[PDB]
């Protein structure tokens, strides 16, 4: 199927003392594989998946140099942004950056992206053409003119379409045992009486990968959203994900209701009904 490589960076200023708290994480699809935390002892980029431990010392040295350089850029930016917005030196502020690349089933470049936020709001982002910039406000418009003059988008486009895709294909091969395996949802239904004449039916999807999934309820073959609850997809903690969807029904009428599960790991969607003897 399709794949992605994405890096996420967060810097939080600490004006009372010291440098910003900085956390970087790298993902292939929904699998975290590297991390950096300015508060951790190593002061190195660290592995978080078995297939990245295959990389030698030159890889770790290179990634550590790049991530520390990113942390210093964020430290400088927090100062510049405090000035652009006429903010006090006393408050804590945040910068967030995400970039990466998507490939299709043929492992060829599909799209690239590079987004930046200040205090949780869009600041500046590269457009899908990988040439242009979207500036949210006049401070970001100043940054946009600066980056047009410095050929920034050209350098980013070269990385996103080239280097990024080359690293992603390498990781997909080295980590094939897990990265190229889809784990279909393990499904079951539970029943929870809410009175002597109504009950909640809860349709569970467990231990699935990747995280993308759709759970829908139908009543007599048509979509049902009234009296339903759908929780956000959540990590199990072992690399897989979970989700559930529930509906309140009149007791005795459970067979009218079906839960429908769609996931990349299921050739055809699954349909579940409550087993009334349970």
């Amino acid at each position: 199927g399709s794949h992605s490589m994405r890096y996420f960076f967060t810097s939080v200023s600490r004006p009372g003392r010291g440098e910003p708290r900085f956390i970087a994480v790298g993902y292939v699809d929904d699998t975290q594989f590297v991390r950096f935390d300015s508060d951790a002892a190593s002061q190195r980029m660290e592995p978080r998946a078995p297939w990245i431990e295959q990389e030698g010392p030159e890889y770790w040295d290179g990634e550590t140099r790049k991530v520390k350089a990113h942390s210093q850029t964020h430290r400088v930016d927090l100062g510049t942004l405090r000035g652009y917005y006429n903010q006090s030196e006393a408050g804590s502020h945040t910068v967030q950056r995400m970039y990466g690349c998507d490939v299709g089933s043929d492992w060829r470049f599909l799209r690239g992206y590079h987004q930046y936020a200040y205090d949780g709001k869009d600041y500046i982002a590269l457009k899908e053409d990988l040439r242009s910039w979207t500036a949210a406000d006049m401070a970001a418009q100043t940054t946009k003119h600066k980056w047009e003059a410095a050929h920034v988008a050209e350098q980013l486009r070269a990385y996103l379409e080239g280097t990024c895709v080359e690293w992603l294909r390498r990781y997909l091969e080295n980590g094939k045992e897990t990265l190229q395996r889809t784990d279909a949802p393990k499904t079951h239904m539970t029943h929870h009486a809410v009175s002597d004449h109504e009950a909640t039916l809860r349709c569970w999807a467990l231990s699935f990968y990747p995280a993308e999934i759709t759970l829908t309820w139908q009543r007599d073959g048509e979509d049902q959203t009234q009296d339903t609850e759908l929780v956000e997809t959540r990590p199990a903690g072992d690399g897989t994900f979970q989700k559930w969807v529930a509906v309140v029904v009149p007791s005795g009428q459970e067979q009218r209701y079906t839960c429908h599960v769609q996931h990349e790991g299921l050739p055809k969607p699954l349909t579940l009904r409550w087993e009334p003897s349970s």
């Binding site: 990634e63 280097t163 690293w167």
Partner: peptide, 9 residues
């Protein structure tokens, strides 16, 4: 692998 591009706002 990460990008080496340094662009300050």
């Amino acid at each position: 692998g990460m990008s080496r591009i340094g662009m300050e706002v």
